Amino acid sequence: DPANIDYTPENASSWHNYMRNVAALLKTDATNLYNAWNSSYKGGESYASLFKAHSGSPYASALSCVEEIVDKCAEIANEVGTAKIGDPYNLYKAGNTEEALYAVESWYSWHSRDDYTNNIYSIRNAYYGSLDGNINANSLSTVIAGANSSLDTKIKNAIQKAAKAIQDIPQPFRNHIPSNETVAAMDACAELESILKNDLKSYIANNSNNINTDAVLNPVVTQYVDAVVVPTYKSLKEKNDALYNAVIVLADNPSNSAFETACDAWITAREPWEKSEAFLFGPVDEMGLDPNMDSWPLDQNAIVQILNSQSWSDLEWSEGDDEAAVESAQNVRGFHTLEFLLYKNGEPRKVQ
Ligand SMILES: [Cl-]
Ligand SMILES: [Mg+2]
Ligand SMILES: [Mg+2]
């Protein structure tokens, strides 16, 4: 029932206000995340400076930075295969097909394949030290290549295999959950997680390989922060600002065209977010910005209740609120709540 709700003339006013409020919070969260890295964190030094310096806490060496980088790449490869794809797959295989269909992150917009593929490109970006698919001179890839060309080539191939396997699932993944292609994508993601957390991490950690000193890894950490992390968060800030502006256009003059234009802005803003999921550490994690912007699944019953009662304060939480209160607010806001409000069955919603 909450899944079947339509945007109608009867609820349009409330629907516009829900969209405005969710888009304003996404704008705030992306700005605060970018500022935490680029300007100041916890009222002090910027997180970009703290990470690049690695002078004690939580990173005392360039190796500690790089182990976090690699751990966080392995974590997203694990999340994508075992949970984003795996949770719907295992529900479906057990015979719980209706629960499986609604378990797919980004199904409202039929965007799961592209979303999860961008998560793998986050790994590529972290490993390449770039955003354009070109291997940077100061990348982890180049460091591994100089010591072990075979391991570097196997890692680059494993990243590409996972991205290609997800793209090979027939569009949309929501309608092809039990496919052979789904299983091949899970396999490719598991192989990628393994080569990162086992082979790569162990190889860098071994002092005998001479690639874990600050002289070797400082330029890798600096380039990862300056060319990957900070520009991705800058792009997310800019694109969440544009997404809010597109929601305002739609709310002020609702039309099929304005819904289509706001949906395009949602995909545009999602890209730097999805391409940041290999670095879910530091500010995005500690500030709770990851679940603020990207909780999934949502509390769909609570969304419909908030829409009909215009209880906008239910979307927000404060420092010191208990865990349940924070999660309840996060489960009714963010990119996926805005996605619900903009899309129906993979297409922009229409004005009746
Ligand atoms: Cl989908
Ligand atoms: Mg168009
Ligand atoms: Mg997530």
Residue numbers in the entry: 33 to 384
The authors write:
Here, we report two crystal structures of this novel protein family, a circularly permuted imelysin (with the GxHxxE motif) from Bacteroides ovatus (PIBO) and an imelysin-like protein (with a variant GxxxxE motif) from Psychrobacter arcticus 273-4 (IPPA). The PIBO monomer is a V-shaped, all helical structure consisting of two domains, D1 (residues 33–90 and 244–384) and D2 (residues 91–243), with molecular dimensions of 73 Å×55 Å×42 Å. The functional site of PIBO is likely located at the domain interface and supported by the clustering of conserved residues, including the buried GxHxxE motif. As a result, our structural evidence clearly argues against PIBO being a metallopeptidase.
